[PDB]
Amino acid sequence: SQSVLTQSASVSGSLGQSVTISCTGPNSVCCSHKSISWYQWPPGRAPTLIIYEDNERAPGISPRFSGYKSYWSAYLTISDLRPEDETTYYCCSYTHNSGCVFGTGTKVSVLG
Amino acid sequence: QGQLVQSGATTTKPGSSVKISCKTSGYRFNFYHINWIRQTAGRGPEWMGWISPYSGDKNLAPAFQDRVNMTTDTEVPVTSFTSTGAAYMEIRNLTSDDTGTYFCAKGLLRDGSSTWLPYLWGQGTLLT
Amino acid sequence: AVFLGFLGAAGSTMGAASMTLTVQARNLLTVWGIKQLQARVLAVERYLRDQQLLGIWGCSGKLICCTNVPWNSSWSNRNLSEIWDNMTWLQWDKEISNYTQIIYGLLEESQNQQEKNEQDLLAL
Amino acid sequence: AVFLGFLGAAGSTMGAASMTLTVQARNLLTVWGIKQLQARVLAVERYLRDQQLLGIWGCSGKLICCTNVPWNSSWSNRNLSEIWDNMTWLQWDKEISNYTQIIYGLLEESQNQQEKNEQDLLAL
Amino acid sequence: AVFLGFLGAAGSTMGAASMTLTVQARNLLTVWGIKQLQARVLAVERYLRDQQLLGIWGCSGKLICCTNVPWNSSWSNRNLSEIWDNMTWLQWDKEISNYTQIIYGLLEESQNQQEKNEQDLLAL
Ligand SMILES: *[C@@H]1O[C@H](CO)[C@@H](O[C@@H]2O[C@H](CO)[C@@H](O[C@@H]3O[C@H](CO[C@H]4O[C@H](CO)[C@@H](O)[C@H](O[C@H]5O[C@H](CO)[C@@H](O)[C@H](O)[C@@H]5O)[C@@H]4O)[C@@H](O)[C@H](O[C@H]4O[C@H](CO)[C@@H](O)[C@H](O)[C@@H]4O)[C@@H]3O)[C@H](O)[C@H]2NC(C)=O)[C@H](O)[C@H]1NC(C)=O
Numbered sequence: 326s327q328s329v330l331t332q333s334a335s336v337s338g339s340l341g342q343s344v345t346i347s348c349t350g351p352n353s354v355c356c357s358h359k360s361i362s363w364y365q366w367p368p369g370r371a372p373t374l375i376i377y378e379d380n381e382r383a384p385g386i387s388p389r390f391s392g393y394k395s396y397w398s399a400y401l402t403i404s405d406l407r408p409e410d411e412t413t414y415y416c417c418s419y420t421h422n423s424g425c426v427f428g429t430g431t432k433v434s435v436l437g
Numbered sequence: 438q439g440q441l442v443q444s445g446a447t448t449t450k451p452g453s454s455v456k457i458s459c460k461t462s463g464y465r466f467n468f469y470h471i472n473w474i475r476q477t478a479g480r481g482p483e484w485m486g487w488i489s490p491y492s493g494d495k496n497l498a499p500a501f502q503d504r505v506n507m508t509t510d511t512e513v514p515v516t517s518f519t520s521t522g523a524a525y526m527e528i529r530n531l532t533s534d535d536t537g538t539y540f541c542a543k544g545l546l547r548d549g550s551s552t553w554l555p556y557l558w559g560q561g562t563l564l565t
Numbered sequence: 566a567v568f569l570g571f572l573g574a575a576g577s578t579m580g581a582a583s584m585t586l587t588v589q590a591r592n593l594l595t596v597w598g599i600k601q602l603q604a605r606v607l608a609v610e611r612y613l614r615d616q617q618l619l620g621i622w623g624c625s626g627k628l629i630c631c632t633n634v635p636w637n638s639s640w641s642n643r644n645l646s647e648i649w650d651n652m653t654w655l656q657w658d659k660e661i662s663n664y665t666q667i668i669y670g671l672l673e674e675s676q677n678q679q680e681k682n683e684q685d686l687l688a689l
Numbered sequence: 690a691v692f693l694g695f696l697g698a699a700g701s702t703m704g705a706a707s708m709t710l711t712v713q714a715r716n717l718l719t720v721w722g723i724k725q726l727q728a729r730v731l732a733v734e735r736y737l738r739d740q741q742l743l744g745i746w747g748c749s750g751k752l753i754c755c756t757n758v759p760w761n762s763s764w765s766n767r768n769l770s771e772i773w774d775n776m777t778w779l780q781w782d783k784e785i786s787n788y789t790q791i792i793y794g795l796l797e798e799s800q801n802q803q804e805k806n807e808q809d810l811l812a813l
Numbered sequence: 814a815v816f817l818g819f820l821g822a823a824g825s826t827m828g829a830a831s832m833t834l835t836v837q838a839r840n841l842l843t844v845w846g847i848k849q850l851q852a853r854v855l856a857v858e859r860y861l862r863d864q865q866l867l868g869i870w871g872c873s874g875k876l877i878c879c880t881n882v883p884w885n886s887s888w889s890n891r892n893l894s895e896i897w898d899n900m901t902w903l904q905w906d907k908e909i910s911n912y913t914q915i916i917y918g919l920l921e922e923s924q925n926q927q928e929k930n931e932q933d934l935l936a937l
Pocket residue numbers: 421422467468469470489490491492493494495496544546547548549550551552573574576577578
């Protein structure tokens with residue numbers, strides 16, 4: 326591992342509640358001069374774009390997922406935890422002519 | 438809004454090279470970039486690079502610039518807004534560190550600030 | 566800008582094609598003369614229909630014209646970015662073909678219920 | 690409202706008919722083809738005359754259009770309530786038939802003596 | 814004023830002729846019927862061209878219409894007084910005949926780069 330964009334290690338939640346995943350790094354990949362994307366990523370399978378450009382959801386994404394980016398860190402909130410949410414979430418910083426600088430990852434458990 | 442089927446799970450040995458296919462359908466293949474992403478057993482996800490099936494333009498991370506052979510065909514138009522394209526992926530100096538699952542990713546939009554963003558992904562291919 | 570010409574941005578994004586409108590606005594207007602005079606009359610007829618529609622909408626004189634009719638999600642539940650920076654106008658015309666008559670009536674009375682509101686405004 | 694249709698309020702009060710204007714605004718625009726092509730051309734000619742008149746009046750684009758020409762009592766010394774809530778537009782056209790050309794000229798220069806006043810306004 | 818009539822101020826100064834515009838704006842719109850129906854169609858065609866040009870300029874509805882395109886001295890380095898109080902419109906048409914197409918394009922995008930500026934204004 327060598328991801329200069331760290332996340333929130335891991336976190337837990339319960340059904341009906343809301344979580345929050347952090348994503349920050351140095352001034353070289355974050356934040357007010359970069360767009361943050363969020364990917365739900367089951368273990369080594371088919372990922373899914375959730376939010377692009379800090380707080381813009383992908384087509385058909387549930388209104389539960391929300392994004393916020395302060396001047397030093399970006400957050401992904403998962404309002405109203407539904408059972409099909411146990412997976413790993415990765416963030417990525419980018420501009421209009423760059424690549425995805427992915428994050429470390431954050432496993433989110435919904436056991437309740 | 439279409440599929441991006443890939444090749445099988447081919448496992449060779451270090452020093453060699455591997456070719457991975459990415460066959461598209463259900464969308465105008467020229468209208469969106471083709472990103473290449475991998476998740477290896479040793480790190481996490483790592484963005485490799487994208488290529489424009491329209492501009493023929495390549496942009497790839499410096500960690501994979503001198504290893505990756507990245508090409509595309511030309512779309513066989515099905516309808517006014519459907520076609521069938523193909524993107525190809527090869528690597529040079531191969532090791533056991535590069536063992537992981539690989540997928541192609543069609544871009545998100547055709548303009549703006551998130552034009553190339555890996556939106557529509559493939560299925561995954563297991564390397565060495 | 567690049568002078569793409571007539572229908573130059575036909576395969577471009579709707580946001581790119583919307584910048585080049587006056588190009589398609591310019592190029593919009595013996596027994597065989599009877600067939601030529603026929604096409605000459607139909608040309609002004611199909612052109613005045615678009616102007617009559619634009620006239621009873623308050624858009625008379627506009628290439629880009631804003632209104633008060635809010636966008637019903639039943640017509641298209643697509644986001645703004647996935648329309649102007651993704652689809653082409655040829656694609657958008659197929660997705661809204663059905664509801665294209667519903668909107669034309671909403672524009673007609675949103676204009677009559679605007680000049681009626683302006684008539685009461687200037688009545689004092 | 691009740692969709693009375695084309696000329697629906699022809700026998701209604703002028704105030705009631707004035708609410709349903711875009712309905713009459715929509716429906717306003719081989720040897721026998723020569724007689725059909727004739728009616729097709731006259732249709733755009735009689736329509737553009739109303740638009741040319743509306744254009745040189747400042748009403749270009751309006752179904753209801755207010756002006757500066759004040760109402761001369763010589764045209765009709767009737768009260769406002771005994772017009773919009775009593776007579777029909779067919780009745781009003783007979784009472785103003787004579788003076789209908791006098792007003793069309795008053796509107797023409799009240800517009801030229803308005804865009805001339807606006808030209809001096811934007812000259813500084 | 815003196816009702817000079819149609820083309821009355823054709824030999825007058827451009828400032829004098831500019832006051833009498835609605836006069837020239839009014840009077841602007843079997844085998845021999847084929848030659849008469851031909852002239853009838855061409856009449857609306859040559860008239861709608863001036864209106865289509867005026868429409869994509871923002872002047873739709875104006876006899877006198879001001880713009881944002883500044884006067885290039887290459888077109889005519891004449892002073893304002895030696896134009897409106899000296900030359901006739903027939904003289905001015907010969908001096909600007911060449912550059913008359915250059916200005917028609919400057920008006921076209923000065924309008925598209927105005928309704929585009931107004932679209933961003935009403936976006937908040
Ligand atoms: C036909 O259809 C195709 C496919 O849909 C259209 O191609 C797409 O156009 C859009 C916008 O026109 C492109 O998005 C832009 O992407 C650039 C990234 O380019 C930069 O980086 C590249 C790699 O580093 C590089 O190629 C570029 O350098 C130049 O040189 C190449 C040489 O091949 C040349 O081909 C390029 O055109 C460049 O000129 C460049 O350095 C990105 O920079 C853009 O963002 C800017 O602009 C947007 C507004 O557009 C703005 O919001 C941003 O903030 C930023 O200012 C923009 O995202 C897309 O990559 C193209 N390709 C796809 C989608 O596959 C094509 O335009 C259509 N043409 C017509 C006529 O319809």
